[PDB]
Amino acid sequence: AMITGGELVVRTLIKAGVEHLFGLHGIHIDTIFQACLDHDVPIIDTRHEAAAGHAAEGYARAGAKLGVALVTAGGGFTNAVTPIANAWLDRTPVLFLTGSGALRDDETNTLQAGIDQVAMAAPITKWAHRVMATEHIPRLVMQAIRAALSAPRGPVLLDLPWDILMNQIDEDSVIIPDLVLSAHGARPDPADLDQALALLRKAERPVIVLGSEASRTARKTALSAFVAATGVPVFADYEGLSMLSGLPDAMRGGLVQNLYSFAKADAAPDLVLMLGARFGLNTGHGSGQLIPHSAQVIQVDPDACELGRLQGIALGIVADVGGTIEALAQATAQDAAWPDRGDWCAKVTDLAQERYASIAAKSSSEHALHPFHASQVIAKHVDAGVTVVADGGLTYLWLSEVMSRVKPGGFLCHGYLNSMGVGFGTALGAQVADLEAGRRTILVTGDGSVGYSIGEFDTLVRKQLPLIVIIMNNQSWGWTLHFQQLAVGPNRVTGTRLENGSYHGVAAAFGADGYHVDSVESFSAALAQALAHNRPACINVAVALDPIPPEELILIGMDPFA
């Protein structure tokens, strides 16, 4: 028959293995909407394009697969910029399909047309391109997919002029190709794999730090066989945590942010193995905090820029992180000459424990519900059947203190962009990935960050998504209000207080469950209540503002343990 370019897009995505798209409708991309309707593909349609974009991210992260986002021309695309920017830095594999002006209505001042979407998207994407001919649609779509999913994973834009989409050709003119890209990643040269193992055996205090790319390939069975052979502790940046949930408990060092007072302990790691973790913000930069200059560092990253960009390393290998762990278990299933790491692993869990006691010792929840305490109520329900998504300022800095101790099904936190509010978006789409697994999603967000996408309680309800939103309400933009007294001066705070409005009143008005809580018990009663029930909820949690997280004081450059 004769199908439209819109249909050609959809066949190609179905051929890849795509089963959900997140989007918001426009006349310009309606041919895709029509084709999805025809091929029984869900198109979760949100209230803001950005929220749909982040929804694709969360699906991609929580799902360990490709996320797809669909936005209309002009305003559709520009509303989509923040999720693209976010997925760019988080290294999140998301295909962004956008409509634009008709080729033939080029340069005529028509509606939603005239802005250079690929130009805009270029410095934010692994690849961005505008389709010039309908026959190109199947192969350009697959190309776009391949680029996003290969290492390092990242966001890709495909600009589908209205003109090309509506247009129609003969089904036989064109070939819908398969996704013919191996699921297995590239492995290091046998020469280096041996040198890195030789180094790890000589190590007295060795550690491994997992990055985002450990989670995208998700090679758990091979990682377990490897830790089970060498017996070395394992840390991760935020994205990496999901991986540490198949590991014995003494071999779990937790969040990379623990390796801080390992110096002040005369116990600083002897060697560091970085698999996908970059010398960015999550690893304490080139400063030496979490990773020590003295230490001999082995860094694996598909992207050779990252190889000792900030510190000098000892060995740097270009390869896929997931494909590397496979090559690691394989070469460690004959060794058997691996030292006992008891005394080392012992202190690792000890130092993490001291921090947990040191914060619980500082926590007074006498007058207003301390935030470190509230996070514990949440900790109580976190296991492999629960994806946790974090947003807000101080509120996610408090969760990190409680997150090393539990074993989550997914954990999705801020990337280098650190854009407040992308929480709803990411969380929503996370739940759609979690529906298959039976996992349930919980968003822990700030009173500020919820305001960005508050309308999404509508989408939650319309699409029947049982996401629980916990709003840690301190009646302010938390992180910034602290900066104002702590970096500027006590009496002068502006543009940061948010002392107005029932967020729970909003959610109830949008059709979701309202809960209001201020005490520890009030909160635990409500969280267990919302979890028991199988529909969307909002919990407005009154927390103190004054308390200063240890992580806030690390990042400006001070010791919270001195």
Ligand X SMILES: Cc1ncc(C[n+]2csc(CCOP(=O)(O)OP(=O)(O)O)c2C)c(N)n1
> Considering only 31-39, 223-231, 344-352, 526-534, which stretch makes contact with a second copy by CB under 8 A?
31-39
Residue 56 C-beta: closest distance to ligand X, Å: 16
**Least CB distance from residue 393 to a second copy, whole Å?**
10
Residue 479 engages a second copy in binding (rule: CB under 8 A) = yes
Mark 45-74 with x for binding to ligand X (rule: CB under 6 A) and - for no binding: ---------------------------x--
**Does 2 participate in binding a second copy (rule CB under 8 A)?**
no
Report how far residue 403's alpha carbon sits from residue 359's, in angstroms, rounded to the nearest whole number: 13
Stretch that binds a second copy, among 189-197, 202-210, 225-233, 354-362 (CB under 8 A): 189-197
Q: Which two tokens stand for residue 431?
A: 């739940």
CB of 371 to ligand X, least distance (A): 7
30, interface contact from a second copy, ligand X, Mg ion, none, CB < 5-8 Å by kind: a second copy
Helix (H) or strand (E) segment spanning residue 440: strand 440-446
Please say which residue, 306 or 447, places its beta carbon nearer to Mg ion: 447
Q: Choose the contact partner of 492 out of ligand X, a second copy, Mg ion, none; CB within 5 to 8 A by kind.
A: a second copy
Beta-bridged to residue 198, according to DSSP, are none
Residue closer to a second copy, measured from CB, 364 or 464: 464
Binding positions for Mg ion, 404-463, rule CB under 5 A: 446-447
CB-count burial class (<10 Å; 0-12, 13-18, 19+) for 104: exposed
Edge to edge, the sheet with strand 234-236 lists 252-255, 234-236, 206-210, 271-275, 296-301, 315-318
- For residue 300, the cross-strand partners are 275, 317
Binding mask 131-170 for ligand X (x = CB under 6 A): ----------------------------------------
Report the residue number, 34 or 418, with the smaller CB distance to ligand X: 418
Which helix (H) or strand (E) segment holds residue 427: the answer is helix 422-437
The answer to whether the Cα torsion of 115, 121, 122, 123 is positive or negative is positive
Are residues 57 and 65 in contact, defined by beta-carbon separation less than 8 angstroms?
Answer: no
Count CB neighbours of 288 within 10 A. 15
Residue 218 neighbours by CB distance under 10 Å: 15
Binding residue for a second copy, selected from 2, 17, 173, 181, defined by CB under 8 A: 181
* 479 sits near ligand X (criterion: CB under 6 A): yes
Count residues contacting ligand X (CB under 6 A)? 27
For position 417 contacting a second copy by CB under 8 A, the verdict is yes
Residue of 117, 289, 296, 474 interacting with Mg ion (CB under 5 A): 474
Over the window 389 to 418, marking each residue x when it contacts ligand X by CB under 6 A and - when it does not, the resulting string is: ---xxxx----------------------x
Instruction: Please list every residue from 100 through 129 that binds ligand X, using CB under 6 A.
Output: 112
Number of residues that bind Mg ion (CB under 5 A): 4
Pick the binder of ligand X from 154, 446, 536, 550 (CB under 6 A): 446
Q: What is the DSSP letter of 497?
A: B
CB of 244 to a second copy, least distance (A): 22
Element (H, E) at 280: none
Residues 377, 518 contacting (CB under 8 angstroms): no
Residues 6+ apart with CB under 8 A from 117: 77, 98, 100, 128, 130, 157, 159
Q: Which helix (H) or strand (E) holds 105?
A: none
Choose between 131 and 348: whose C-beta lies nearer to a second copy: 131
Nearer to ligand X, 330 or 496 (CB): 496
Q: Does residue 229 belong to the site contacting a second copy (CB under 8 A)?
A: no
| Window 283-312: residues binding a second copy (CB under 8 A) | 285-286, 303-305, 307-310, 312
By the rule CB under 8 A, 113 interacts with a second copy: yes
Answer yes or no: are the C-beta atoms of 208 and 259 closer than 8 Å.
Answer: no
Q: What is the DSSP string of 178-218?
A: -----SSPP---HHHHHHHHHHHHH-SSEEEEE-HHHHHHT
Identity of the residue, 88 or 477, whose beta carbon is nearer to ligand X in the bound complex: 477
Judged by CB under 6 A, the stretch of 62-70, 242-250, 403-411, 474-482 that binds ligand X is 474-482
Strand 2-4 to 168-170 pairing:
antiparallel
Output phi, psi for 370, to 5 deg.
Answer: -55, 155
Count Cα neighbours of 460 within 13 Å in the Cβ-side half-sphere: 31
When asked if residue 25 is in the footprint of a second copy (CB under 8 A), the reply is yes
Separation of alpha carbons 504 and 515, rounded Å: 6
Locate all alpha helices (DSSP H) within 23-74, ordered by sequence. 30-38, 49-63
Tokens of 66: 């490709």
Least spacing, CB of residue 392 vs Mg ion, in Å: 6
Interactions with ligand X, residue window 24-43 (CB under 6 A): 24-26
The window from 9-17, 105-113, 341-349, 363-371 that contacts a second copy (CB under 8 A) reads 105-113
Q: After which residues is the chain broken (C to N over 2.5 A)?
A: none
- With CB under 5 A as the contact rule, the residue among 478, 536, 547, 550 that binds Mg ion is 478
Please report whether residue 371 would count as binding Mg ion according to CB under 5 A: no
Which entry of ligand X, a second copy, Mg ion, none binds 305, CB below 5 to 8 A by partner kind?
a second copy
How far is it, in rounded angstroms, from Cα 531 to Cα 285? Answer: 38
- In 500-537, which positions are buried (b, 16+ CB within 10 angstroms) versus exposed (e)? eeebbebbeebebbbbbbeeeebbbebbeebeeeeebb
Decide whether 42 or 342 has the Cβ nearer to a second copy. 42
Binding mask 345-384 for a second copy (x = CB under 8 A): ----------------------------------------
Binding site for Mg ion (CB under 5 A): 446-447, 474, 478
Binding site for ligand X (CB under 6 A): 24-26, 72, 75-76, 79, 112, 392-395, 418-421, 446-449, 472, 474, 476-480
